[PDB]
Design a protein around this ligand. Structure first.
Ligand SMILES: Cc1cn([C@H]2C[C@H](O)[C@@H](COP(=O)(O)NP(=O)(O)OP(=O)(O)O)O2)c(=O)[nH]c1=O
Ligand SMILES: [Mg+2]
Ligand SMILES: [Mg+2]
Length: 428
DNA sequence: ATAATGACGCT
DNA sequence: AGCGTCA
């Protein structure tokens, strides 16, 4: 009577080193080389926000300064984020994202989960492919980039060798009917994801990885296991061994404080150890929702549905003014607000044309010097007009009372961040 | 002095 | 509404 959470087929498709592929497609000289994407350039070469797998082999990572990365990888090639109105501008990658999401949209209902990934609910697609195939077995040729997590088992030294032995074992169990209806559905799901990824690559030039499983969390976890340019099937049966040495922080939403307290309070390291607690016990420690969610999740069960949403819910831009650069005059604050408001306007206008909708709320966020928190303060106002001067004016209006300076011009405390967000969209 | 962002829960 | 979490 226990629903094992094998009702759905869900996939997570995530692009490999995405911003790097976008720059490598446009500049062929960067292809198949250690490469990274940096923003800003004058401070220690710029901050790295995407790294190719060639560069990763030298230990180059995100957030590294480019000057440091070059110490690790002397031949590292760099591409810079477009700069516009004094700030980083991500338009090229937003546009490339749209290319990818629109292709995926052709196959099924997707939930845009980031600029470079979406969840796919393939349950319905699998059923109709299952009927269309009469009853013929699934061939290994239908899954040329697929890993079956946990296989091979029992009675080859190179990686593609292992992949095939695992797949051969899985497929041979499938046709002997030694697996389950859920396992077949996952397999069929994976054939479709092969097709989605081939379409993505053919039509964009971008490579990507995927996870196929019964829920979003497992699909996400599965994606990462065999990056790059591979997809991974994580079956319900693979979960006990998978989770038995799986650090807790690796599962989506447990990488922060909650996962830390799980570890700390329960005295555990791995996701599987959670199974020994009653749901009521988990709820007593982490609350009703988290308790329930953890109780089901450590058994590979999760119910969050793939939401039908291809478009971002908000449209925002921000700039940090770290340390000495912190804004400390009124006309500094006003001028940057206008820069933000101006980017926002052209993005909102593009949004209104493409997607037939209008934002109706403007949100202003600031960081003050000394504050740890991402936002020191949030205020909102009406967004009734896509006008940069009005939006910036209205944004100033609603924060100007933060100026503790008795002096007219000076701004105190100095602002370490400005952030404008358009929200509360409605059909237009 | 990672930066720029986006989704969402809580009260 | 305004703040806190996680990525
Ligand atoms: C996590 C993260 C990503 N990005 C950008 C750069 C990435 O290329 C793009 C997709 O994020 P990602 O999937 O987490 N990383 P990746 O696509 O570069 O590499 P891979 O997914 O590990 O293959 O989003 C940032 O600009 N700041 C970030 O903190
Ligand atoms: Mg990616
Ligand atoms: Mg991603």
């Amino acid at each position: 009577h226990m629903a094992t959470g094998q009702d759905r087929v869900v996939a997570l498709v995530d692009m490999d080193c995405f911003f790097v592929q976008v720059e490598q497609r446009q500049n062929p000289h960067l292809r198949n080389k250690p490469c990274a994407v940096v923003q800003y350039k004058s401070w220690k070469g710029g901050g790295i926000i995407a790294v190719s797998y060639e560069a990763r082999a030298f230990g180059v990572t995100r957030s590294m300064w480019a000057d440091d990365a070059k110490k690790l990888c002397p031949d590292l090639l760099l591409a810079q984020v477009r700069e516009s109105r004094g700030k980083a501008n991500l338009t090229k990658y937003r546009e490339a994202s749209v290319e990818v999401m629109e292709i995926m949209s052709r196959f099924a209902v997707i939930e845009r989960a980031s600029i470079d990934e979406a969840y796919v609910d393939l349950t319905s697609a699998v059923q109709e492919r299952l009927q269309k195939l009469q009853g013929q077995p699934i061939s290994a040729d239908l899954l040329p980039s697929t890993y079956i997590e946990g296989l091979p088992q029992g009675p080859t030294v190179q990686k593609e060798g292992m992949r095939k032995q695992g797949l051969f074992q899985w497929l041979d169990s499938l046709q002997i009917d030694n697996l389950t209806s859920p396992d077949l559905q996952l397999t069929v799901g994976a054939v479709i994801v092969e097709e989605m990824r081939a379409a993505i690559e053919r039509e964009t030039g971008f490579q990507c990885s995927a996870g196929i499983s019964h829920n979003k969390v497992l699909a996400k976890l599965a994606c990462g296991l065999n990056k790059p340019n591979r997809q991974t099937l994580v079956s319900h049966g693979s979960v006990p061994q998978l989770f038995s040495q799986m650090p807790i922080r690796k599962i989506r939403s447990l990488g922060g404080k909650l996962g830390a307290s799980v570890i700390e309070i329960l005295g555990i390291e791995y996701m599987g150890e959670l199974t020994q607690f009653t749901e009521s016990q988990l709820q007593s420690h982490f609350g009703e929702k988290n308790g329930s969610w953890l109780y089901a999740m450590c058994r590979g069960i999760e119910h969050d549905p793939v939401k039908p949403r291809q478009l971002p819910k908000t449209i925002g831009c921000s700039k940090n003014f770290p340390g000495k650069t912190a804004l400390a005059t009124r006309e500094q604050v006003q001028w940057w607000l206008l820069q933000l408001a101006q980017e926002l306007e052209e993005r909102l206008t593009k949004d209104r044309n493409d997607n037939d909708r209008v934002a109706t709320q403007l949100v202003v966020s600031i960081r003050v010097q000394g504050d740890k928190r991402l936002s020191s303060l949030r205020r909102c106002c009406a967004l009734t007009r896509y006008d940069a001067h009005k939006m910036s004016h209205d944004a100033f209006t609603v924060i100007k009372n933060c100026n503790t300076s008795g002096i007219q011009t000076e701004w105190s405390p100095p602002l370490t961040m400005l952030f404008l967000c358009a929200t509360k969209f409605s059909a237009s």
